[PDB]
């Protein structure tokens, strides 16, 4: 019993309504009358938590903002007056027919105003050098939207293939993202050059910001 969800991700502004849909492969009525269709939300860093069961029944504690409906093959969850604490991954789930199965999830994303990042650089630690390697860290803190471009420059030469990047999930206090990018070099390559720059392109900056340091 395949459960398919749409959209796969859903930007929505605070106070607005979000609507998520779940379609099953076959019917999910259990030949007892009831249909065992359920909605879970997994907030960042947390376990999934039960919101709705048997289609439209709110689980205790669940705000009245959340509702379920649907028939036999087609199910909807609606979230009125969306609050920032509602962001994460919503999953539908079927225990009508064995094996019980989950849809692949829908990411609720809080739309808010652009926010340029605060950009910081960190040179390698002396400690790391002593060991043979040099990592230069670039931090883009609390920005919106999630799209950010980070270019690493060593003596003005654009670098490629020698850095990694990750981004946090959306933050609930202010609906922003953060991003760390690491440039990894040989102690040797690190020692030969002077100017270590991280240059950031973003929707909230009229033109790029470059933060640099000199070895």
């Amino acid at each position: 019993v395949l459960m398919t969800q749409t959209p796969l991700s859903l930007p929505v502004s605070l106070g607005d309504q979000a609507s998520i849909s779940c379609r099953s492969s076959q019917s999910i009525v259990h030949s007892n009358g009831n249909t065992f269709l359920e909605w879970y939300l997994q907030k960042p860093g947390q376990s999934p938590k039960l919101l709705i069961y048997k289609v439209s029944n709110r689980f205790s504690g669940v705000p009245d903002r959340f509702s379920g409906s649907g028939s036999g093959t087609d199910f909807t969850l609606k979230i009125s007056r969306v609050e920032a604490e509602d962001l994460g991954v919503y999953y539908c789930f079927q225990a009508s027919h064995v094996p019980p199965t989950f849809g692949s999830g829908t990411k609720l994303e809080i739309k808010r105003t652009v926010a340029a990042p605060s950009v910081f650089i960190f040179p390698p630690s002396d400690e790391q050098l002593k060991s043979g390697t040099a990592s230069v860290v670039c931090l883009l803190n609390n920005f919106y939207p999630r799209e950010a471009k980070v270019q690493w420059k060593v003596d003005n030469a654009l670098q490629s293939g020698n850095s990694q990047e990750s981004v946090t999930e959306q933050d609930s206090k202010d609906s922003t993202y953060s991003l760390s990018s690491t440039l990894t070099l040989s102690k040797a390559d690190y020692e030969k050059h002077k100017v270590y720059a991280c240059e950031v392109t973003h929707q909230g900056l009229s033109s790029p910001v470059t933060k640099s340091f000199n070895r």
Partner: protein
């Protein structure tokens, strides 16, 4: 208050075995059916096992049948999943859950424990500071770079859990070497810099690595 607390995860070789445990508290454990659900790296949720309150029936999906045993200890209210002949596809976060009978829903969940099935040996991280400067500046940002470890997870706290606001612990990245690295950063008032103490607390259970790095300007 109702709780489930899991343990036993870690790194195991293909075709090895491992037993997960899930300590329940706060309810009449032996009167519920209980399950295990895993969450793959792509964030898909998959049902893995269920055991009736009587212990009489056990139910498994085809991918796991013959290899995994769910069992329970009723004196100690503890749930178990014995996993054997592990494969690469078994790597995942494993959750235990209470399957309420009237509604057939999972109303309490464990915090998760992660299992990594791999041929490679564990490797403990190095922990290097990301010092606050005029280059990370009335707020300054500092941090910890936890480099070159396998497998996941690594956990990071600051000041032993005393500091949480403006803390960002990033998802692990893969290096070209096939080892992971991660960053944990925090922004603070730069006036605090000379005066207040900032330490990251880093644990990598699989390599029994436990480090505290004081990070100073």
């Amino acid at each position: 208050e109702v709780k489930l607390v899991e343990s036993g995860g870690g790194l195991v070789k293909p075709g090895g075995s491992l037993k997960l445990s899930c300590a329940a508290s706060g309810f009449a454990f032996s009167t519920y059916d209980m399950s295990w659900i895993r969450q793959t790296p792509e964030k898909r949720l998959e049902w893995v096992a269920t055991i009736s309150s009587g212990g009489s029936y056990t139910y498994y999906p085809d991918s796991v049948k013959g290899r995994f045993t769910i069992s329970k200890d009723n004196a100690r209210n503890t749930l178990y999943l014995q996993m054997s002949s592990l494969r690469s596809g078994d790597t995942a976060l494993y959750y235990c859950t209470r399957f309420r009978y009237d509604g057939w829903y999972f109303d309490v969940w464990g915090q998760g424990t992660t299992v990594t099935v791999s041929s490679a040996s564990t490797k403990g991280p190095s922990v290097f500071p990301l010092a606050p400067s005029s280059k990370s500046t009335g707020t300054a940002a500092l941090g910890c770079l936890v480099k070159d470890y396998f497998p996941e997870p690594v956990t990071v706290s600051w000041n032993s859990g005393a500091l949480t606001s403006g803390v960002h612990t990033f998802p692990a990245v893969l290096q070209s070497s096939g080892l992971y690295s991660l960053s944990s950063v925090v922004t603070v008032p730069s006036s605090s810099l000379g005066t207040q103490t900032y330490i990251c607390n880093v644990n990598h259970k699989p390599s029994n690595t436990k480090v505290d790095k004081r990070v100073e300007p």
